[PDB]
Design a protein around this ligand. Structure first.
Ligand SMILES: O=P(O)(O)OC[C@H]1O[C@H](OP(=O)(O)OP(=O)(O)O)[C@H](O)[C@@H]1O
Ligand SMILES: O=P(O)(O)OC[C@H]1O[C@H](OP(=O)(O)OP(=O)(O)O)[C@H](O)[C@@H]1O
Ligand SMILES: [Mg+2]
Ligand SMILES: [Mg+2]
Lengths: 343, 343
């Protein structure tokens, strides 16, 4: 029968787990039945062994089976997510959050999964909070937000309450683990498309495999400068998930007229500074930050288009993203979003 | 700037640690300044990375620098240990403990370090306890025992109190780690010689390296049937440590007239069953068990000699081991040992 000595021993022997074992482990963790030492041992052993898409899939499956769902028929079939693993260690502005606003304003339904910072000065949730957006809304109100505003935000702690023991262990040991991949893979609203950032190059393919298994239309992105976003300072590696198959690509914004930026141009600060950066971009300020936002917003729209060619999709995505900002639609959407939570 | 995120991150990246890093980690663990999750993360990461002699040497050094020592000039310079990692999986009789008694009766000072059972029905300390030997004595009384009886037992919890945090995590995760190597390396009396058993064929060389750095005269043994003992069922692998240099050897008991035995002939049971097996051997009962104890006892005597050839040393060791039993000296020694703890 399943046991920690069994599973841990199999991982330390550098062996892939048998079908169901990873699931049993996570369920133990997700039911308060695991000791912190056992949680930590499993997270580390899984990571150092080299996790497969199947194993990480079981982990995410367990989390989603325990998570608060959104009500029936409240999430549009073509909804998209824009979120990353975090942990690239580079203090940038909140590109995923900013891109998500622009995408929603372009008419693409967004149900964003997210969380506070772990190792950065301000995460997506922190910055949205600084903007006046309600981040801790429950299933019913997230559903209403999505319908009325075009965007909703799922706070991971809110929808994954029984993950709190695992989250505590992540904080204690500090080092990244397979757990760091689970946030982007466990959106409780379960959108079928997304632009998903991965800070860990060696694990981006595995995340893509989980999505492929769900037959999602996802672009798993890793900036070759290390960002868990589509970068503008150099090329980005993209694992394109479509038709249940993964396809590795290198992406160069220069092929779309974007100038090479320096990483310090994308730098941000605390929640207030990063919130000011959002208002700046949505306000029509041109520059490095805008470029990075438009590029990422377009990538999400390409992932959305993939639910049903590469070059024309990016061109339309870039057109719609730039237009969403220039018309003021993106700025208006945030205001309407802020107003929603207050009412 | 030593930290857990730093050291754990280095290990998870499959990199050897820098000088002092393993020592810092163990000292944190040995001072109650490490979370269970951190301890477990460290133990697993060290194992899967594959620990080096330097690193293991640092961990043991920390333990010995926090351990209760024996009083000044109470341990002979040529005292030996007979002890193993355990965890060979096979529930056998207490071979090391039996050899230790015989070795002591042969005139070689023995200061035994040991513990109760982890995954066995009965460990060395359990069996000794069932024989009426007092195991939980302090440094003063172990010194007296070593002087008056010719043998002493160091109970690890008694001498390594600050190890309890590491011990708890080991029992929680269950899986073997680098911690399973430390027992034989952390005898508080610090004997310079011994017959050391390693159940892990791929870590025995590491252990030998640690002893070699100490300029210790030891034989690190791995029974090719999996035992952390010199076996009689088949050949054994011996990492012979002398003059700070390790030599790897294949050892054949048949080269000394030992019949091949079956592993179930060496099988044991609870403390009461194993205690009776000790009395049987020391009583002069011929058989597989006697052959195993004489062989191991001889190995410790050979290691003792190494403090100052190979076959002639083994031949002499076998003679002294056999005679120590046949003269009743080993049976008497145990009797006097039991008597000492009560007087
Ligand atoms: O502190 P870190 O570990 O480095 O992670 C920074 C943020 O990135 C993730 O979400 P998201 O992609 O939505 O944030 P973003 O808008 O800044 O890109 C994560 O949930 C954090 O909120
Ligand atoms: O429970 P295990 O993990 O399987 O280990 C069995 C015993 O072996 C070790 O002692 P030692 O080798 O010194 O004595 P022994 O071989 O006679 O039992 C260890 O301290 C245990 O007491
Ligand atoms: Mg992001
Ligand atoms: Mg032993």
């Amino acid at each position: 029968v399943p046991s920690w000595p069994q599973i841990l021993g199999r991982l330390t022997d550098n062996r892939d787990l048998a079908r169901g074992q990873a699931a049993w482990a996570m369920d133990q963790i997700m039911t308060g039945n695991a000791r912190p030492a056992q949680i930590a041992a499993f997270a580390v052993a899984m990571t150092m062994k080299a996790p497969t898409a199947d194993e990480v899939g079981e982990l995410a499956g367990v989390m989603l089976s325990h998570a608060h769902p959104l009500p029936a028929d409240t999430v549009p079939d073509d909804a998209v997510d824009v979120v990353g693993t975090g942990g690239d260690g580079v203090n940038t502005v909140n590109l995923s959050t900013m891109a998500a606003i622009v995408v929603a304003a372009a008419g693409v339904p967004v149900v964003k999964h997210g969380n506070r910072a772990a190792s950065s000065l301000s995460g997506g949730a922190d910055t949205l909070e600084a903007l006046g957006v309600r981040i801790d809304l429950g299933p019913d109100l997230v559903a209403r937000s999505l319908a009325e505003v075009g965007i909703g935000f799922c706070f991971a702690p809110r929808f994954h309450p029984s993950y709190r023991h695992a989250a505590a262990v992540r904080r204690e040991i500090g080092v990244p683990t397979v757990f760091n991949l689970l946030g982007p893979l466990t959106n409780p609203a379960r959108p079928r498309a997304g632009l998903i950032g991965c800070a860990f190059a060696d694990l981006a393919e595995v995340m893509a495999g989980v999505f492929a298994a769900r037959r999602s239309s996802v672009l798993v992105v890793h900036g070759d400068d290390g960002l868990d976003e589509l970068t503008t300072t150099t090329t980005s590696t993209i694992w394109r998930v479509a038709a249940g198959s993964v396809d590795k690509l290198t992406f160069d914004p220069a092929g779309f007229g974007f100038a090479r930026a320096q990483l310090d141009q994308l730098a941000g600060g605390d929640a207030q500074a990063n919130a000011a950066a959002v208002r700046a971009v949505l306000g029509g300020a041109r520059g490095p930050v805008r470029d990075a936002v438009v590029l990422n917003a377009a990538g999400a729209i390409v992932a959305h288009a993939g639910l049903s060619e590469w070059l024309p999709a990016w061109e339309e995505g870039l057109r719609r993203a730039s237009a969403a900002i220039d018309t003021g639609a993106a700025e208006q959407l945030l205001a309407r979003w802020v107003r929603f939570g207050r009412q």
